[PDB]
CSV table of C-alpha atoms and ligand atoms in Angstrom, one decimal:
chain,number,residue,atom,x,y,z
S,46,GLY,CA,-14.0,134.1,66.3
S,47,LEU,CA,-12.3,131.8,68.8
S,48,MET,CA,-15.4,131.3,70.9
S,49,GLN,CA,-17.3,130.1,67.8
S,50,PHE,CA,-14.4,127.9,66.6
S,51,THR,CA,-15.0,124.1,66.2
S,52,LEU,CA,-12.4,121.4,65.8
S,53,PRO,CA,-12.7,119.1,62.8
S,54,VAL,CA,-13.7,115.6,63.8
S,55,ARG,CA,-10.7,114.0,62.1
S,56,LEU,CA,-8.4,116.1,64.3
S,57,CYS,CA,-10.2,114.8,67.4
S,58,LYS,CA,-8.7,111.3,67.2
S,59,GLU,CA,-5.2,112.4,66.1
S,60,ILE,CA,-4.7,115.1,68.7
S,61,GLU,CA,-4.7,112.4,71.4
S,62,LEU,CA,-1.5,110.9,70.0
S,63,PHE,CA,1.9,111.7,71.4
S,64,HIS,CA,3.5,112.2,67.9
S,65,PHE,CA,0.8,114.5,66.6
S,66,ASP,CA,2.3,117.4,64.6
S,67,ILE,CA,0.4,120.8,65.0
S,68,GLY,CA,2.5,122.2,62.1
S,69,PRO,CA,-0.1,122.0,59.3
S,70,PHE,CA,-2.9,123.7,61.2
S,71,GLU,CA,-1.6,127.2,62.1
S,72,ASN,CA,-5.0,128.9,61.9
S,73,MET,CA,-6.4,126.3,64.4
S,74,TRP,CA,-3.8,126.5,67.1
S,75,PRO,CA,-5.8,128.8,69.5
S,76,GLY,CA,-8.8,126.6,69.0
S,77,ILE,CA,-6.7,123.4,69.5
S,78,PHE,CA,-5.5,124.8,72.9
S,79,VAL,CA,-9.1,125.5,73.9
S,80,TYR,CA,-10.1,122.0,72.8
S,81,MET,CA,-7.3,120.5,74.9
S,82,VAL,CA,-8.2,122.6,77.9
S,83,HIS,CA,-11.9,121.4,77.7
S,84,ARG,CA,-10.9,117.7,77.3
S,85,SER,CA,-8.4,117.8,80.2
S,86,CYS,CA,-10.1,120.1,82.7
S,87,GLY,CA,-13.7,120.1,81.5
S,88,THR,CA,-15.9,122.4,79.5
S,89,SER,CA,-16.5,124.9,82.4
S,90,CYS,CA,-13.1,125.1,84.2
S,91,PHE,CA,-12.5,128.6,82.6
S,92,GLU,CA,-14.7,131.4,81.5
S,93,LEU,CA,-14.7,131.1,77.6
S,94,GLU,CA,-14.4,134.8,76.9
S,95,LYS,CA,-11.6,135.3,79.4
S,96,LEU,CA,-9.8,132.2,78.1
S,97,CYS,CA,-10.0,133.2,74.5
S,98,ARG,CA,-8.8,136.7,75.5
S,99,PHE,CA,-5.9,135.2,77.4
S,100,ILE,CA,-4.8,132.9,74.6
S,101,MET,CA,-4.7,135.7,71.9
S,102,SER,CA,-2.7,137.9,74.2
S,103,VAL,CA,-0.3,135.1,74.9
S,104,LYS,CA,0.0,134.7,71.1
S,105,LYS,CA,0.7,138.4,70.7
S,106,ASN,CA,3.5,138.2,73.4
S,107,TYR,CA,5.5,135.7,71.4
S,108,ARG,CA,8.1,137.2,69.0
S,109,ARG,CA,8.8,136.2,65.4
S,110,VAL,CA,12.0,134.4,66.2
S,111,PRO,CA,13.0,131.2,64.3
S,112,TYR,CA,12.2,128.7,67.1
S,113,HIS,CA,11.0,130.0,70.5
S,114,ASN,CA,7.8,131.3,69.0
S,115,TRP,CA,4.0,130.8,69.1
S,116,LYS,CA,4.2,127.5,67.3
S,117,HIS,CA,6.6,126.1,69.9
S,118,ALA,CA,4.3,127.2,72.7
S,119,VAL,CA,1.4,125.2,71.3
S,120,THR,CA,3.7,122.2,70.5
S,121,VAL,CA,4.8,122.1,74.2
S,122,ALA,CA,1.2,122.5,75.4
S,123,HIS,CA,0.0,119.6,73.2
S,124,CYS,CA,2.7,117.2,74.5
S,125,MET,CA,1.6,118.1,78.0
S,126,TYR,CA,-2.0,117.4,77.0
S,127,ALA,CA,-1.1,113.9,75.9
S,128,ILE,CA,0.9,113.2,79.1
S,129,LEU,CA,-2.0,114.5,81.2
S,130,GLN,CA,-4.6,112.5,79.3
S,131,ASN,CA,-2.6,109.2,79.6
S,132,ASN,CA,-2.0,109.8,83.3
S,133,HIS,CA,-5.1,111.9,84.2
S,134,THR,CA,-5.7,110.5,87.7
S,135,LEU,CA,-2.2,111.1,89.1
S,136,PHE,CA,-2.7,114.9,88.9
S,137,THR,CA,-5.1,117.3,90.5
S,138,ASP,CA,-7.6,119.5,88.6
S,139,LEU,CA,-5.5,122.6,89.6
S,140,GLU,CA,-2.3,120.9,88.3
S,141,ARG,CA,-4.0,120.3,85.0
S,142,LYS,CA,-5.1,123.9,84.8
S,143,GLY,CA,-1.7,125.3,85.7
S,144,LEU,CA,0.5,123.0,83.7
S,145,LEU,CA,-1.3,123.6,80.3
S,146,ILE,CA,-1.3,127.4,80.8
S,147,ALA,CA,2.4,127.2,81.9
S,148,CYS,CA,3.3,125.2,78.8
S,149,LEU,CA,1.7,127.8,76.6
S,150,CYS,CA,3.4,130.7,78.4
S,151,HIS,CA,6.8,129.0,79.2
S,152,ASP,CA,8.8,130.9,76.5
S,153,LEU,CA,6.7,134.1,76.5
S,154,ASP,CA,8.6,137.1,75.0
S,155,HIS,CA,11.6,135.1,74.0
S,156,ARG,CA,14.3,137.1,72.1
S,157,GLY,CA,16.2,134.2,70.6
S,158,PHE,CA,19.2,134.5,72.9
S,159,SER,CA,20.4,132.0,75.6
S,160,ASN,CA,20.8,132.8,79.3
S,161,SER,CA,24.6,132.8,78.8
S,162,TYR,CA,24.4,135.6,76.2
S,163,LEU,CA,22.4,137.9,78.5
S,164,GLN,CA,24.7,137.2,81.4
S,165,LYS,CA,28.0,137.5,79.6
S,166,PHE,CA,27.0,140.6,77.7
S,167,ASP,CA,25.3,142.4,80.7
S,168,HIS,CA,21.8,142.5,79.3
S,169,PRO,CA,19.2,144.3,81.6
S,170,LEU,CA,17.3,141.0,82.1
S,171,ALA,CA,20.3,139.2,83.5
S,172,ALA,CA,20.7,142.1,86.0
S,173,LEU,CA,17.4,141.4,87.8
S,174,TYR,CA,17.5,137.6,87.1
S,175,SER,CA,20.6,135.9,88.5
S,176,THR,CA,19.9,132.2,87.5
S,177,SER,CA,17.4,131.0,84.9
S,178,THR,CA,17.3,134.4,83.3
S,179,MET,CA,14.7,134.1,80.6
S,180,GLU,CA,12.6,131.5,82.5
S,181,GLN,CA,12.0,134.0,85.4
S,182,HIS,CA,11.1,136.7,82.8
S,183,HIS,CA,8.7,134.2,81.1
S,184,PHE,CA,6.8,133.8,84.4
S,185,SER,CA,6.9,137.6,84.9
S,186,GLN,CA,5.3,137.9,81.5
S,187,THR,CA,2.6,135.4,82.4
S,188,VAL,CA,1.5,137.2,85.5
S,189,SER,CA,1.5,140.5,83.5
S,190,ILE,CA,-1.0,139.1,81.0
S,191,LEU,CA,-3.1,137.5,83.8
S,192,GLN,CA,-3.3,140.9,85.5
S,193,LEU,CA,-4.8,142.5,82.4
S,194,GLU,CA,-8.5,143.5,82.1
S,195,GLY,CA,-10.6,140.4,81.5
S,196,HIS,CA,-7.7,138.0,81.1
S,197,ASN,CA,-7.6,136.7,84.7
S,198,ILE,CA,-8.8,133.1,84.1
S,199,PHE,CA,-8.2,132.2,87.7
S,200,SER,CA,-10.3,135.0,89.1
S,201,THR,CA,-13.1,132.6,90.1
S,202,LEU,CA,-10.7,130.8,92.3
S,203,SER,CA,-10.2,131.4,96.0
S,204,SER,CA,-7.1,133.4,97.1
S,205,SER,CA,-5.7,130.1,98.5
S,206,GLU,CA,-6.1,128.3,95.1
S,207,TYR,CA,-5.0,131.4,93.1
S,208,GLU,CA,-1.6,131.5,94.9
S,209,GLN,CA,-1.5,127.7,94.7
S,210,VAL,CA,-1.9,127.6,90.9
S,211,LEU,CA,0.7,130.2,90.0
S,212,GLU,CA,3.2,128.4,92.2
S,213,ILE,CA,2.6,125.3,90.0
S,214,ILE,CA,3.1,127.7,87.0
S,215,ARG,CA,6.2,129.3,88.4
S,216,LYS,CA,7.9,126.0,89.2
S,217,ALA,CA,7.0,124.5,85.8
S,218,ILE,CA,8.4,127.4,83.8
S,219,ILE,CA,11.6,127.5,85.8
S,220,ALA,CA,12.0,123.8,85.2
S,221,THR,CA,12.2,124.4,81.4
S,222,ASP,CA,15.7,125.9,82.1
S,223,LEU,CA,17.7,123.0,80.7
S,224,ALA,CA,20.5,123.8,83.2
S,225,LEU,CA,18.4,122.5,86.1
S,226,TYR,CA,17.2,119.4,84.3
S,227,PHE,CA,20.5,117.4,84.6
S,228,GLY,CA,20.4,117.5,88.4
S,229,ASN,CA,16.7,116.9,88.5
S,230,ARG,CA,16.8,113.8,86.3
S,231,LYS,CA,19.7,112.3,88.3
S,232,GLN,CA,17.7,112.6,91.6
S,233,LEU,CA,14.5,111.2,90.0
S,234,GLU,CA,16.5,108.3,88.6
S,235,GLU,CA,17.9,107.7,92.1
S,236,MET,CA,14.4,107.9,93.7
S,237,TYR,CA,13.1,105.3,91.2
S,238,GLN,CA,16.1,102.9,91.4
S,239,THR,CA,15.9,102.8,95.2
S,240,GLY,CA,12.1,102.4,95.1
S,241,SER,CA,11.6,105.5,97.2
S,242,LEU,CA,9.7,107.7,94.8
S,243,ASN,CA,6.4,108.9,96.2
S,244,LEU,CA,3.8,111.1,94.4
S,245,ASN,CA,2.3,112.1,97.7
S,246,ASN,CA,5.6,113.7,98.5
S,247,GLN,CA,5.4,117.3,97.4
S,248,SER,CA,9.1,117.8,96.6
S,249,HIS,CA,8.9,114.6,94.5
S,250,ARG,CA,5.8,116.0,92.8
S,251,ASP,CA,7.4,119.3,91.7
S,252,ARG,CA,10.3,117.2,90.3
S,253,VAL,CA,8.2,114.8,88.3
S,254,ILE,CA,6.3,117.8,87.0
S,255,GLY,CA,9.8,119.3,86.3
S,256,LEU,CA,10.8,116.3,84.2
S,257,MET,CA,7.5,116.5,82.4
S,258,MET,CA,8.2,120.1,81.4
S,259,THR,CA,11.5,119.1,79.9
S,260,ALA,CA,10.0,116.1,78.1
S,261,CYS,CA,7.4,118.5,76.6
S,262,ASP,CA,10.0,121.2,75.9
S,263,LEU,CA,12.2,118.8,73.9
S,264,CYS,CA,9.3,116.9,72.2
S,265,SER,CA,10.4,117.8,68.7
S,266,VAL,CA,12.7,114.8,69.0
S,267,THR,CA,9.5,112.6,69.4
S,268,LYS,CA,7.7,113.5,66.1
S,269,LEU,CA,8.0,111.6,62.8
S,270,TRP,CA,11.5,111.9,61.3
S,271,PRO,CA,10.7,114.6,58.6
S,272,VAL,CA,9.1,116.8,61.2
S,273,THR,CA,12.0,116.3,63.6
S,274,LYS,CA,14.5,117.3,60.9
S,275,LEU,CA,12.5,120.3,59.8
S,276,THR,CA,12.3,121.6,63.4
S,277,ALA,CA,16.0,121.2,63.8
S,278,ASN,CA,16.4,123.7,61.0
S,279,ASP,CA,14.4,126.3,63.0
S,280,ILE,CA,16.5,125.6,66.2
S,281,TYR,CA,19.9,126.1,64.6
S,282,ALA,CA,18.7,129.2,62.6
S,283,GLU,CA,18.1,130.8,66.0
S,284,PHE,CA,21.4,129.5,67.5
S,285,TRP,CA,23.4,130.7,64.5
S,286,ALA,CA,21.7,134.2,64.7
S,287,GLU,CA,23.1,134.4,68.3
S,288,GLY,CA,26.5,133.2,67.1
S,289,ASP,CA,26.7,135.9,64.5
S,290,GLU,CA,26.2,138.6,67.2
S,291,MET,CA,29.1,137.2,69.2
S,292,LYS,CA,31.2,137.2,66.1
S,293,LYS,CA,30.4,140.9,65.5
S,294,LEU,CA,31.5,141.4,69.1
S,295,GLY,CA,34.8,139.6,68.1
S,296,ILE,CA,34.1,136.5,70.2
S,297,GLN,CA,33.9,133.0,68.5
S,298,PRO,CA,30.7,131.3,69.7
S,299,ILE,CA,30.4,127.6,70.7
S,300,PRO,CA,30.2,125.3,67.6
S,301,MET,CA,26.5,124.8,68.2
S,302,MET,CA,25.9,128.5,67.4
S,303,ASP,CA,28.5,128.7,64.7
S,304,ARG,CA,27.0,128.4,61.2
S,305,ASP,CA,30.4,127.7,59.8
S,306,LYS,CA,30.6,124.4,61.8
S,307,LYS,CA,27.2,123.1,60.5
S,308,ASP,CA,28.9,119.9,59.3
S,309,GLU,CA,29.0,118.7,62.9
S,310,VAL,CA,25.2,119.0,63.3
S,311,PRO,CA,24.5,115.3,63.0
S,312,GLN,CA,27.1,114.5,65.7
S,313,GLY,CA,25.8,117.4,67.7
S,314,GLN,CA,22.3,116.0,67.6
S,315,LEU,CA,23.6,112.5,68.3
S,316,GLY,CA,25.2,113.9,71.4
S,317,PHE,CA,22.1,115.7,72.4
S,318,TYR,CA,20.0,112.5,72.2
S,319,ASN,CA,22.4,110.3,74.1
S,320,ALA,CA,23.2,112.9,76.8
S,321,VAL,CA,19.9,114.8,77.1
S,322,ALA,CA,16.9,113.4,75.3
S,323,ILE,CA,17.1,109.6,75.7
S,324,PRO,CA,17.9,109.9,79.4
S,325,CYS,CA,14.9,112.3,79.8
S,326,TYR,CA,12.3,110.0,78.2
S,327,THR,CA,13.8,106.9,79.8
S,328,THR,CA,13.3,108.3,83.4
S,329,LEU,CA,9.9,109.6,82.4
S,330,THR,CA,8.8,106.3,80.9
S,331,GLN,CA,9.9,104.6,84.1
S,332,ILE,CA,7.9,106.9,86.4
S,333,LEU,CA,4.9,107.2,83.9
S,334,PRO,CA,4.7,104.0,81.8
S,335,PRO,CA,2.0,105.4,79.4
S,336,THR,CA,4.6,108.0,78.2
S,337,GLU,CA,6.6,105.2,76.4
S,338,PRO,CA,5.7,106.3,72.9
S,339,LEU,CA,7.7,109.4,73.5
S,340,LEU,CA,10.9,107.4,74.3
S,341,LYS,CA,10.1,105.0,71.3
S,342,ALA,CA,9.9,107.9,68.8
S,343,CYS,CA,13.0,109.5,70.4
S,344,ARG,CA,14.9,106.3,69.9
S,345,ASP,CA,13.7,106.1,66.3
S,346,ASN,CA,15.0,109.6,65.6
S,347,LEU,CA,18.3,108.7,67.3
S,348,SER,CA,18.9,105.9,64.8
S,349,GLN,CA,17.9,108.3,62.0
S,350,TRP,CA,20.7,110.7,63.0
S,351,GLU,CA,23.0,107.6,63.2
S,352,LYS,CA,21.8,106.8,59.7
S,353,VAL,CA,22.7,110.4,58.6
S,354,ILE,CA,26.3,110.1,60.0
S,355,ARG,CA,27.2,106.9,58.1
S,356,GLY,CA,26.0,108.5,54.8
S,357,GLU,CA,23.0,106.2,54.5
F,768,EHI,C1,16.4,118.8,69.0
F,768,EHI,C2,16.5,119.9,70.1
F,768,EHI,C3,15.4,120.2,71.0
F,768,EHI,C4,15.6,121.2,71.9
F,768,EHI,C5,16.9,121.8,72.1
F,768,EHI,N1,17.9,121.5,71.2
F,768,EHI,N2,19.1,122.0,71.3
F,768,EHI,C6,19.8,121.4,70.3
F,768,EHI,C7,21.2,121.6,69.9
F,768,EHI,C8,21.9,120.2,69.8
F,768,EHI,C9,23.4,120.4,69.5
F,768,EHI,N3,24.0,120.7,68.4
F,768,EHI,C10,25.3,120.8,68.6
F,768,EHI,C11,26.3,121.1,67.5
F,768,EHI,C12,27.7,121.1,67.9
F,768,EHI,C13,28.6,121.5,66.9
F,768,EHI,C14,28.2,121.8,65.6
F,768,EHI,C15,26.9,121.7,65.3
F,768,EHI,C16,25.9,121.4,66.2
F,768,EHI,C17,25.5,120.5,69.9
F,768,EHI,N4,24.3,120.3,70.5
F,768,EHI,C18,24.1,119.9,71.9
F,768,EHI,N5,18.9,120.5,69.7
F,768,EHI,C19,17.7,120.5,70.3
F,769,MG,MG1,12.7,128.3,77.3
F,770,ZN,ZN1,10.5,126.1,75.2
């Protein structure tokens, strides 16, 4: 049914926008991804039967957790689409192929627990993955689906370009570990301020792509206020579920994961915007000027949380 799916003409104009919310169109998400692939890469860059088989298998490998779910995957993929479409020339055909697949697969098989939980509580996954625990597992899940019968969408590529594309994917998924973002953004800010940033430099390229992955991962802060607030509910519901497990183990979780400290959510968001989000989209807008609407919408939601704090 996915190969026969067609996108409504009204969605065609609105999908191009940075602030587009996929929320209301759940039944259309697989077809929306296909549409986005064809517009960014071309109508023939993947075999349609293999692509539709890959997408539905990716969908199946997302769990029914409050936040890191199938919806989040498509939301991140859409924000990447808008970035790629507004900056199409700066990126190669292979980068466009890998980054959209990576965004859809970046949280594959997420359990709803942070990398800290798995490490501190000696979860099997943290045994084989030292740093960026879940992120390395997400890439491992992506390869596993690719290596299934009739799912290998890169099979028509040469062995040179096959190993090239999954390196883009690997680096992109690992970059979604927020722990690595803070250092990455500082370096990119430095490279820009000194006027020494170069897109032909491959280490610079992986870093810009890295910041792009974060920008897409956090893009719920770039939607219209009501969507932004509603997503926050899903985020904390997952955090609080992790905090409850720590409480059953006797340990008090950090206030972010403590449902009894939910009064400090507005100030918690305020902190997240000023320390994480605003800096992320500021540096991205500097490097890629067409991405400005992301920073504009993030600033608008910042003042909204400021408006929440002062009881307005
Ligand atoms: C909006 C969004 C996107 C992606 C990821 N995240 N992660 C968050 C937690 C924000 C947060 N919330 C608290 C907090 C602290 C004490 C009490 C209640 C909340 C602290 N922080 C940093 N927001 C997001
Ligand atoms: Mg993740
Ligand atoms: Zn994510």
